[PDB]
A paper describes a structure:
SK2–4 was co-expressed with CaM and purified from mammalian cells in the presence of Ca2+. The cryo-EM structure was determined to a final resolution of 3.1 Å with most regions of the structure well-defined by density apart from the C-terminal HC helical bundle. In the presence of Ca2+, the C-lobe of each CaM is bound to the HA and HB helices and the N-lobe is bound to a short helix in the S4–S5 linker, S45A, on the neighboring subunit. The measured SK2–4 pore radius (3.8 Å) indicates that the S6 helices are in an open conformation in the presence of Ca2+. In contrast, the S3–S4 linker of SK2–4 is well-defined by density in both the Ca2+-bound and Ca2+-free structures and forms a two-stranded anti-parallel β-turn (residues Gly231–Asp253) that extends over the S5 and S6 helices. Arg240, Phe243, and Tyr245 within this loop form direct interactions with residues at the C-terminus of the selectivity filter. In this position, the four Phe243 residues form edge-to-face interactions that create a hydrophobic constriction at the extracellular opening of the pore with a radius of 1.8 Å, which is expected to prohibit efflux of hydrated K+ ions measuring 6 Å in diameter. Therefore, even though the intracellular gate at Val390 is open in the SK2–4/CaM Ca2+-bound structure, the observed conformation is expected to be non-conductive. In addition, the backbone carbonyls of Gly360 and Tyr361, which typically form the extracellular K+ coordination sites one and two, are rotated away from the center of the selectivity filter and the ion conduction path. As a result, only the two intracellular K+ coordination sites, three and four, are intact and occupied by K+.
Small-conductance calcium-activated potassium (KCa2.x, or SK1, 2, and 3) channels are activated by increased intracellular Ca2+ to induce potassium efflux and regulate membrane potential. To enable high-resolution cryo-EM studies of human SK2, we designed a chimera (SK2–4) that contains the transmembrane and extracellular domains of human SK2 and intracellular domains of human SK4. SK2–4/CaM forms a non-domain swapped tetramer with four CaM molecules bound, similar to the previously reported SK4/CaM structure (Lee and MacKinnon, 2018). The CaM C-lobe is constitutively bound to the HA and HB helices, and upon an increase in intracellular Ca2+, the CaM N-lobe binds to a unique S4–S5 linker, inducing a conformational change in the S6 helices to open the potassium pore and activate the channel.
Residue numbers in the entry:
A (entry chain B), B (entry chain C), C (entry chain D), D (entry chain A): 118 to 490
E (entry chain F), F (entry chain E), G (entry chain G), H (entry chain H): 4 to 112, 119 to 147
The structure:
Amino acid sequence: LGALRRRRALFEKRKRLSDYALIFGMFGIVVMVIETELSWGAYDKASLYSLALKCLISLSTIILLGLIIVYHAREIQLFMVDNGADDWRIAMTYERIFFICLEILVCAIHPIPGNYTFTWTARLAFSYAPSTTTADVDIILSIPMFLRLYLIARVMLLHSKLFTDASSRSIGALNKINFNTRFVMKTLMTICPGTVLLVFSISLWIIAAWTVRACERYHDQQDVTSNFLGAMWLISITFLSIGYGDMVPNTYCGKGVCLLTGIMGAGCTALVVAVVARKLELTKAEKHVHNFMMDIQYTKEMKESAARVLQEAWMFYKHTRRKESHAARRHQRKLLAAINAFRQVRLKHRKLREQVNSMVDISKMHMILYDLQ
Amino acid sequence: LGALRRRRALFEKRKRLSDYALIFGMFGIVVMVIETELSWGAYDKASLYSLALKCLISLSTIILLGLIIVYHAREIQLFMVDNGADDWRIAMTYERIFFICLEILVCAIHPIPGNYTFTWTARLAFSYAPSTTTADVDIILSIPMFLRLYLIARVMLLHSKLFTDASSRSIGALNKINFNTRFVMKTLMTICPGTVLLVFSISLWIIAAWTVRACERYHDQQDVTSNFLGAMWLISITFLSIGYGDMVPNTYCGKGVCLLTGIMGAGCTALVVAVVARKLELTKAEKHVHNFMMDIQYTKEMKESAARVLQEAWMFYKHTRRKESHAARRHQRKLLAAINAFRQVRLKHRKLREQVNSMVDISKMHMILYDLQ
Amino acid sequence: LGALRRRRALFEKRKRLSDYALIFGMFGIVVMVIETELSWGAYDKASLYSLALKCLISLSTIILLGLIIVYHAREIQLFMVDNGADDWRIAMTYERIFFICLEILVCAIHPIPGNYTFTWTARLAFSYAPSTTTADVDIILSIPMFLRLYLIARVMLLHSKLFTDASSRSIGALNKINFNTRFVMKTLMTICPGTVLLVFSISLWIIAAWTVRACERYHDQQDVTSNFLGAMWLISITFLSIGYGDMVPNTYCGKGVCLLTGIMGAGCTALVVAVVARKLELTKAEKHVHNFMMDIQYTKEMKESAARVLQEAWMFYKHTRRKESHAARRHQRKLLAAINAFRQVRLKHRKLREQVNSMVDISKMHMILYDLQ
Amino acid sequence: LGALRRRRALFEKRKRLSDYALIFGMFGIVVMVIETELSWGAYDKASLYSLALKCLISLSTIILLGLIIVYHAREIQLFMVDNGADDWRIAMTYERIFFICLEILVCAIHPIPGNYTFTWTARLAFSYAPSTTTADVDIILSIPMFLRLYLIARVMLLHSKLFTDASSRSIGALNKINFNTRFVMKTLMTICPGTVLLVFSISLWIIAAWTVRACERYHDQQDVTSNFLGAMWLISITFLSIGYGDMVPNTYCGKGVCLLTGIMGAGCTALVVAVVARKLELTKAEKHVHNFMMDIQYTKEMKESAARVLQEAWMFYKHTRRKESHAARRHQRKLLAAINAFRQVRLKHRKLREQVNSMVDISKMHMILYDLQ
Amino acid sequence: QLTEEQIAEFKEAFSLFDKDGDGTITTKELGTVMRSLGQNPTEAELQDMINEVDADGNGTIDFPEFLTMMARKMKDTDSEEEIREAFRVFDKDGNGYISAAELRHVMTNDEEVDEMIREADIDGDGQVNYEEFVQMMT
Amino acid sequence: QLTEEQIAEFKEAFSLFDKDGDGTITTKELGTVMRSLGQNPTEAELQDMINEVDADGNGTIDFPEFLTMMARKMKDTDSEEEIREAFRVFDKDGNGYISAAELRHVMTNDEEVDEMIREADIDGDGQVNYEEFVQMMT
Amino acid sequence: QLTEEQIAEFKEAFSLFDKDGDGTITTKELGTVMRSLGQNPTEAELQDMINEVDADGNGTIDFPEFLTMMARKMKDTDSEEEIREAFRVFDKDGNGYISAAELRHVMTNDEEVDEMIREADIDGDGQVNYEEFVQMMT
Amino acid sequence: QLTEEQIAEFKEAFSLFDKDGDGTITTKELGTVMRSLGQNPTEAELQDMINEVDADGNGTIDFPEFLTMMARKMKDTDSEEEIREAFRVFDKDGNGYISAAELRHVMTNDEEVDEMIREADIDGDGQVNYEEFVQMMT
Ligand SMILES: [Ca+2]
Ligand SMILES: [Ca+2]
Ligand SMILES: [Ca+2]
Ligand SMILES: [Ca+2]
C-alpha cells in the first residue's frame, strides 16, 4: 500500500511536468513563427529585435530541456517503485537511453541567436533554371522545431482518465489489457474518429502550408508558392492527390513537405470515407423500423398491382367478346404489363422477407433455447 | 386530442411555406444566372435590362425572407404546441436564434440593383503574371446565392411520408427511433444510394462549372477556363482527382471551387464504388443456385477427369508390356498430368462443399432446434 | 410440349443471328480502322482505295442491319410463343420499339463513301492557340462505330449455358431466380472477376488510345498525342488518375475519351484491389493449419522464454549472494527484460487462443445440438 | 523410407544452389550499377575499367547460369524421386522446358564487354523537341538485369520452415493444404502485412528511381529527371498518383517505369490502408473493457442529467409560485434543455446496451447449450 | 415430340430431382432438393406445390408431368402463376372463394364491379372461384 | 375532433397493432409487433407498458386509448416519459418511493433539498411519490 | 535409415499426433487433432482412414506406420490416393467392385474397354477390384 | 495510509466488483463481472483466482485484500504473476512440484543445473516448490 501512495505522487509530478513541457515547447514554436515572419520584411537578422526574439527561443529551450530531464528522472523513480528496484542504474537500458537522448536532440534544435548565412541553390520548377541566394541558417533550424509536437501525445496520454483510474485498471487487469499510448489511440478512433481525423487534417494543413511558404520564399520572386494562400491550395490538392498544377515547389524542402502531405492524405482520406460510410449505415434498431414500414408498403403495392391485373384482364375479356379488336389488343398489352409489374413487386417483397429473416436469425435462436430451459 | 389537430394544421402550413420558399429561392438563382450571362455581352451594368433583372432578384429576396420569417414563426407555434408552452419566448434559445439569423443572412445575399465596381487583381496560372481588371460587385454576391439550396433539404424532409405518418411514428416510437433530417438521409442511402449520388454529382457538376466560368471570365482572355465546356472538363478531372492539366484557375474563386470539387469527389467516388460492389454481389438465393449448378458441373468434371486417369494408365500399361518405350514414356507423362488434373478438380470441388456448408450453417441450426421442441 | 420445341428452335435462330451480327459488326470496325490509318498517309479520301474500303463498311452495315431486323423479328415470335399471343402487334411496346430503333441508329453510323469535309477548330493545350484545319467528315462517324460492341454482350448471354439449360432453369425456378443479362454479369464477377476486369481494361486501353490518336492527329504537328505509343501512356496515366503531364488533349474528342477513361479507371482499379485483397486472404481450411502451427510455435517460445526467466533469475541471485554488485545489477536488468519478453509471448499466445475460439464457434454449436438429438 | 532420405538430400542441395544463385545474381546487379554510374563521368566505355567491370558481370553470369542449370537438374531428380520415375525424360513437359528456358534468358541479359553504340532519339517533355544522342548499347541490357530478383522469391520459399517441416506437412496433409509459393505469400500477408508492403515499397523506390535516372541521363541536360533525388520525388508522387509536375520523363523507358510505379502504387496504398484500418480496430477483449467503462460512464451521466431535470424543475416551480415571471421563464427554458439532454444520454446508453448484446450473442448461446447437457 | 437433345437434358433435370431413380419425384426428394437450395419448405407447402402439376393425382411427379411443369417454367414469366397469386391476394379470408365484399374492397385502392361479378360467375354459385378467375383472365 | 384523414391514418396504425381486428390491442398483439421489430419484451414489461395508457383498466387498449397514446407520442420529445425516467433513476431501491436519503445522494454528483422535500410532499406521507414528482416538474 | 534430425522431426510430428505419449495413435487422438483443425470426421471415416496405413492391423498407428504414412505424404502429390479416388468415383454402387456396366458408362463422357477388362481381371473373378485397378495404373 | 481521493476511487472499484454491497466479493460477483467482460471462467479457476489474494482464507475478498490486489495490479507488469506462470509452464506434470528431470528438460531448448537445484532446495525435500522458485527469482 505504501508504493500505491508513492506511485500516485510520482504520476502527478509526471503529469505536471508534461504540461509545462508543452507550454515551453509550444512557446518556442510560436516565437519561432513570429520571428521568421518578421525577419523577412519587418527587420533583418542583424537587428536587436531578431536577437531579442531568438534569445526567447533559446531561453525557452533551456527550460524545456530542463523539464525533459526532470520528467525522465521521474520515470526512473517510477520504474524503481513499480519494479521494486533501489538503484537507478537498473532502469538504464539501451532503448531508454536512446529515447532520452532522442528527445533532447529533437527539443534542442532552434534558431541560435546570431547571424549566420549559407548559400542556397535550387532549380526552379517548369523552367529548370538555377537560383542562388544567400539564405539564413535559422531556416534549417526553424522547421525541425515542429517535431516538439510529440509532447502533445504525451500530454494526451497522461491526462487520460483510463490511464490512471483504479476502476479501468482493475477491469482491464481481469481482461489482460495493456494501457499504453496505442490503446488510447484505438479508443480515440472508436469514440470520435471524425474529430481526430478532422483536427489532424486542419493542424497539418496550417503547419505544412507555413513550412512550404517559409522554405520557398528565398527562391520565389513571383509570389506563387511563397504566398500563404497559394501554399494552402498546394497542400490541399496534394492532400487529395489531385496534382500540383503550376504550384510545383522550387526547393527540396517544399517537395519533401508535399511528399509528406501526399502520404498522410492517402490514408487520411480513406479513413474519413470509412467513417462516413459507417455513419450513413442504419443501426439494427433503425433497420427493423425501415423493414417494418417497407413490408407495409409492399403489401399495399401488391394489392394495387393485382387489382390492375384483374382490371385489365376483365377489360380485355369484355372487348374480346364485344367484337372489338384494336381495344382488346391494347388491353392485352396492358394486361401483360400489369402481370409483369405485379410479378416485380412480388419478387421485391420476397427479397424483403429474406432480408428480414437474415437479420432476425440469432435472436430467434435465443428464444428457442430459453424455451428448452 | 386537441393538440393533434393543431399539430397537423401547423405542419401543413410549414410544408406549404417551405414549398414557396423553394419557388422564390430558385427563382432568384435562375434570374441571377440569366442576368450574369447577359450582362457580359448582351448589355452592360448601366442598362435598364440589368436594373430590371436585378430588381427581380431583389423583389424575390424580399418575398423569400418573408416566407422564412413566417416559417420560423410557425416553428415557434409548433414548439409551443408540442412542449405545452403558452409564451413564445420560451422557444427562443441561443441555437434557434443563431440559425434563424443564419438563414436570413444566407437568403439576403443577392446582386443589389445599381452599378458598383471593384478592382480585381489575380495572378495568371503557368505564367505568374498579374492581371488587373475592373470587375462588377455583383459577382461576389451572385455566387453566395447558391447557398439557398439548403431549402431543397427542408422540402425533402417536410414532404417525406414517414416524417408525419401515424404508422411510422407509432412503430418508430416503440423502437425509440428519432425521425430527423439524418434519418431521412440514411434511408435514402439504403433505398436508392445510386440515384442520390448520381443526382448530387450531376447537380454539383453544372453548378461548379458555372461558378468557375463566372469567376474566371474577367481574367481569362484566351477562352480556357472561361469556356463552359472547358470548365466542365476541369471540374470532372478534379472530381476524379486526375489533375488540372492546363486548366489551372487564374482566380482564387476558381481555385476554391476546384478544391471543393476535389473534396466532394474524394468521397463521392468511393461511395459509388461501394454501391456498385454491393450491386454486383450475388444474393443469398442466387448464391444457392450458383453453388447447386457448380456442384453438378464439378461432379461431371470429376467423372471425365478420373476417366482420363484410367484411360492414360491403361495405355501406359499396354505400351510398357508391348515392348514400346517412346510411346509408354509419352503416356506416362500424360498419366501424371491426368492425375494432377484429377486432383485439381477434386480440390476445387472440396472447396465448394466447404463454401456450401459455411453459408448453410445457421439455417441448419434452426431446424435442429425446431426438432427438439 | 409443342411450344417447348418451338422455343428451342427460335432460340437457336437467335443465337445464330447474334453470331453473324458480331461477325459483320466487328468486320466494319476493323475495315474502319484500316481505312482510317491508311487514308492519312497511304492515300487520300479522293482515291479509289478509300471508295473501295468505305464501300466495304457500307455493304457490311446493310447486312448488319438486316441481321438486327431479323433478330428482332425472332424476338417477336419468341414473345408470341412464350406469352401465348397470335398477333405480332401485342409485342410492340414503347420500350421495345425505342430499343429496336436505338440499335438500328447505333449500327447505321459508318463512314459514308464520298469525300466531305468540315472545318475543325481547336485550342491547343498549354499554349491556348487556335488551330484551324479542314478535317474529313468520316472521323465523326468512325468513332461511333465502336458502339457496336454491345453485340458482344448479346453473344455472351446467348452463348451462356445456364441461360438455356433445362437443369439451371428448373433449379432457378424453385428459387425464383431471374436469368437475365445482369445475372450473367454477377456470376462472371464471382467465377473470374480478375479475368473480366483484365480483359475489359486491356480492350479499353487499345480502343481509347486509338480514338485519342485518331481525333488528335489533325491538330497535332509535333507527334505528342497523335503518336499511338504516346496515347497509350496518356490513357494509362488517366486510368490510374495520376495526371496528364504534357499529354493534354488538344481536342474535345480526346478530352472526352480521357474523361471516360478516368471514370472507368476510378472503379476498375478499386474493384481490382478488392479482388486481390480477397485472393490474398487465407481460406478457412488454411487458417486452421496456420493457427495450429502458430500454437505449436508459441508453446515452444514460452518454454524458452520462461527458461530465460529462471536462467537470469538464478544468475542474479548467485551474483548478489557472491558479493558481486556490477554483475548482479546487469543480470537484474536482463531478468526484467526476460520477464517482459516472457509476458509478451504469453499475451500473443493468449490472443491466438481467442482467435482460434472465435473462428471455431458455430461448428462446436453443431456438435452440441447433434449430441442432444 | 529410402526416398525420404533422398528427398531431404536433394532439397538441401536445392536450397544451397538457390542461395548461390542469389549471391551471383545480386553481385552482377551490383557491379552493373557501379559500372553504369562510373562509366558516365569517371571513365568512358573505351577504358580498361569498363572492360574489367563488364567482364565481372559476364563471368558472374556464366556462374549464375551454371547454378540455374544444376538447380533444375536437381528438380528433375526430385521429380523422379517423388513420382517414382527412373527416366529423366518423363519430367520434361512443355511448361517445365519453357520455364527453364525463360529463366536462362532472363539471367543471361547483361552488359557484354565491348563498346557498341546506337542512336537514341526522344521527344522532350513540355517542349516537344527532338533530342538525338549516341547512347551505349549496355543501357538496354542493364535494366533487364533487375529481373534476376525472382531468385529472391525462390530463396524465400526454399528457406521457409513450413515448406519442409515434418509437422506442418502432416498437419497440412490432413487438411488438404497445398504448400506452394502462393501459400507462403498468403501467410506473409497475415503475419507481417505491414513489413512486406513496406520493404517492397522501399525496394521499388530505389530501383525505379535509379532506372529512371539511368535512362533519362542521355536526354536530360538540365538535371531534372537525371538527378537521383529528383527521380525519387518523381517515383513517389507517381506512386501516390498525385501527378508528374515538371518531372515528366523525356524517354519511353522513364515513362514505362513511371507507369509501372503507378500500377503498383494503386494497389500498395490501398493494401496499406487496409492494414492500418485493421490495426486501429479494438480487439474483442479490448472492446469488452471499453464497453464496460462506457457503461459506468453513462450510468454516472444519467444520474447527473436527471438531477439537472429535477433541479431545474423545482426552480421553475418555485419561481412560478413566487410571482416571478422572467426567472420562471428562464428556468423553464433550462428545464426543457435538461430534459432533452437527459433523453440524449438515455438514448446513447440504450445504444450501448444494444451493442453489448450484439457482440455477446454466440457466447451466451454456448452457455445455454452446456446447461442442457 | 421433342428432339433427342431436349429429351436428354429434361431427363437430366428429372434425374437431378429424382435421387433414387425410381421414375417418380417423391415429396421427400423435392423437399431435400429445396433444402439444398437454402429454402425451408413445410410439408403442407411441399404437398401443395407437388400437386399443382400432378395431373393423375397419384401423389408423385412422373416424367410427363415434369415435362409439362418445365414447359410452364421455361419461359421468363408464367401467366398462370401470376394469375393464381393475384387470386390468392384477392382472397383475404383464404377460403378459396372471393366474396363480393372483397371484390368491392380491392377496387378502393359499383356498377362495373357488379358487371364483373355477373360475367365472372359462370356456374351461378353466387361467388367467384379460381377457375372463373382464370377464365376471366384469359 | 380530428378530421377524416387523421382518423383514417390513426385507424390504420391501430389496425397495424390489432391483427385480429376485435377493436382492442391484446398484450399478445403488442408483444408480437415488438418481436417483429427485433425487441425481446418480457411479459412483465409488456403488461407494464400496456397499462400506462390503459385509462379504464380493462387490460386492453381500445381506439380512444391508442389515440391518446399517439397524441403523447407524435411529438419529438414527450415530457411525461422523461420525467418518469428521471423519477425511476432517482429511485435506487425500486419501491416506487424516493426517500430523503436518495434525494440527498442524487445531489452530491442541505437546506435547499429540505425545502424541496417540504414543498414536494403534498399529501404529507413523509416521502415523495411519482404524482408529487410530476406535480413538482410542472 | 534416416538421419538423426529427420528422425527427431518425425518423432516431433508423431508426438503431436500422440497426446498421451503411449507410442500409438489411437483413433481418439486422430479425431481430436482433426477436430482441432476445423474438420468434423465421423467414427466410420476415422477408422477407415486409420487402417489405410495400419500395416499390422492392431487398430493403432505406431512409429513405423506413421513414418510410412509420412513418406507417402511428404511429396506434393501422392499417386496412390489419386488412383484410389478414381477407383472410388468409378464405383457408383459403392460395393468395392466396379462392374462392366460402370466401365462402359464412365467412357461415354466397346472393344477397347473389353480388352481393358480382360487384361485387368488378373484373378478371373469376372470383375475388377482395387488391387487390379492399381496394378493396371502402374 | 492512502489519501482521500485514492481511497474513494478504490472503494468505487470495490463496489463495482461488489454488487450487493455486503463488503465482500463473493465468487459469484467476480464470475458475473468476468462474464460481463466476455470471459467464460469455470468455478475451479474462479476459486483459484479468488484465493490468490485472499489472505485470511475466509473465501471472500474484503477491502484490504482488494487494496493489496490493486497495489499488485496497478503497475504495468507484475513480477509475481510472471514468476508464477514460469513456474507453471516449468511444471509439465502439474503436481505443483518441478522435478529434476523437468529442470534438465527445460534447459535443452549439467553441473550448473545441479548447483541450481542444490541452492534452490531450501527445505531439503528433494525437489523444488513455488516458494523456493520465488525465493530464487528474487
Ligand atoms: Ca373470400
Ligand atoms: Ca427509495
Ligand atoms: Ca460396381
Ligand atoms: Ca513435476
